[PDB]
Amino acid sequence: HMRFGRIATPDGMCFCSIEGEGDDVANLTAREIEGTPFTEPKFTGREWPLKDVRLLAPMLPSKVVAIGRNYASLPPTLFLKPPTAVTGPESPIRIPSFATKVEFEGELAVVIGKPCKNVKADDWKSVVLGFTIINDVSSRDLQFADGQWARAKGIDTFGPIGPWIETDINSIDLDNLPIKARLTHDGETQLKQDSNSNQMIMKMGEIIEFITASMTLLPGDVIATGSPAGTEAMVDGDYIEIEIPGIGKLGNPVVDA
Amino acid sequence: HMRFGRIATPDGMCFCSIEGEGDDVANLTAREIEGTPFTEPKFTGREWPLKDVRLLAPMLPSKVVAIGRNYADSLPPTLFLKPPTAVTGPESPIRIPSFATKVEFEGELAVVIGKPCKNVKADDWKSVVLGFTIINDVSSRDLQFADGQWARAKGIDTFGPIGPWIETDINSIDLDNLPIKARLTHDGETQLKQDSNSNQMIMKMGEIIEFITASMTLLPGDVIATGSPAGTEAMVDGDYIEIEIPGIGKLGNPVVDA
């Protein structure tokens, strides 16, 4: 099945299908569709080289439910990031002056496909539209000061999502999926996160079961399935780029608000 | 000026204005409004005696932002979120799942946001509020302890009753002296199990709004739960809980095992 994105246009914006070979934007074509990812696609015929077009968050979720402490001591835990934290590829992560020690977190993100409640673990594939990347940006100093993580992870722009939604969920092997983050600081880039979905303590089905036992999930809701708990701080001028092979890259410049 | 609600009627759901004296539903009338309450509201002409329709949660908020540790009588006040899916209306059951134990209520003054805003200065807070309502910030104390993050304990479906309507004359409410009371009916006996006052707040209204909006954009319909004492009384299947805030009214919900 297809890859679905959203892009700026001159008339505003539109969903598209992303077609072509790599994860590499240079080989890819955005083809405009009418409708959403939730219905049967038909194409208007406007098509762009992906390098020429501005990708947006592939979905504007009613809520983002995130799992803390899910990466190989306290058990995995649920928290929320507000819909206002969500932004897209190349949008600035805008850091307020009072938010310090701000770190990235590359995570595999799941998009819910249909309304669901009390989903059993091995039935999880039936409620998922696809996978995407989220950068669960957090001020570690606020996280610590506040106790509840909501403010430190819920500042506007602290949830980049993208670059598109991969609906072919069998293409993604969850026993071995690298999740990488490359940080550029003072003009140099290093690999600052190197994890793998095989490190997840609660696996995909358990997560969905765990969440939906408590709360109803709606189409377009995003689940952030976790990361290592401490990474590396980012500052004005940096660039952070998460890569999950098979999905693509989610990059964002970092600026002072 | 107005009290705004949402109602279910034989014809479907709508926004409405609630008119008449008192808190007494026999005396009140619902007047359908055109569209939503954020603009100058226009009546469509349809109306019902309040007794013939059903109050719903007065908004469908994009998010619910809540403050912990905001009542005096220490770690400073802290913000958290309740998901929109937690929201329910007056008289709807609070449905407690089996894994959720020591479930307590918390009566709170709720603020409903009236326009999109960010970086609001504390002393400009009134310009962004539509009005006041009541929220019951229902919380599994056991899950709050097991999870550390309160999101699940407070975010289970139905754990955010809101209502009964939104009071837009916000000056009619004395934030320096607002009693907030809760009566729990257990085993057919009703007792006062919360007796607080908004003048116990550590961050006052304007500072809460500044604090929140310094971090997060707020949208029309978004709800702020301004706090409560951190411990009340556990509720079980069969109980009934009613929060009362004079000037707004009463928010009652039955309790059931999910």
Ligand SMILES: [Mg+2]
């Ligand atoms: Mg995270």
Ligand SMILES: [Mg+2]
């Ligand atoms: Mg009709």
Ligand SMILES: [Mg+2]
């Ligand atoms: Mg509370």
